[PDB]
């Protein structure tokens, strides 16, 4: 629920999180800040690709 857009989805059969529609993150530091607040600093690392547009 911390992500403003639909980037991370919940998989019911495996009871874990997945990545669906990765090109909707909008480069907003929301999931990273939530992970840092919850106690996981290096949980999700998102970096922009330089040679892809």
């Amino acid at each position: 629920e911390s992500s403003p857009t639909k980037v991370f989805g919940m998989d019911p059969v495996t009871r874990q999180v997945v990545v669906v529609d990765p090109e909707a993150y909008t480069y907003d530091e929301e999931v990273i800040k939530k992970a840092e607040a919850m106690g996981k600093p290096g949980l999700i690392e998102i970096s922009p690709k330089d040679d892809s547009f």
């Binding site: 840092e36 607040a37 106690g39 600093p41």
Partner: protein, 136 residues
Amino acid sequence: TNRSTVKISNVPQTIVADELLRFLELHLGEDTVFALEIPTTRDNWKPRDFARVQFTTLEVKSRAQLLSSQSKLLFKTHNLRLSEAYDDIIPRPVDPRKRLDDIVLTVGFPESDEKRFCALEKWDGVRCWILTEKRR
């Protein structure tokens, strides 16, 4: 091993005792923290940078020390360093056997040469704590 009270080195200035208690109970076992007090430079609106926490069992204290030595305690991007304290928050012995509740206490003196003991006043439901470090 003499006392179970542990002093935390650095804690954030914006936290409350409940948050730290919840963090400790999440990392450690459930309701394994007896007392937690954060000193304040004012009456009720300016806590200090350190805090003192007293655990229930010495094994919990050893586990907390081991976790702190490995830098596995991260509470609000702050590394909690644990060190020994000077005195306990409450003078309570760390033993499940030395704590006696609901026992009969009476006072008196021997009456005659025979093995007889007269009771002056009797009290019921008293609490007896045996402290070895304090010798009392």
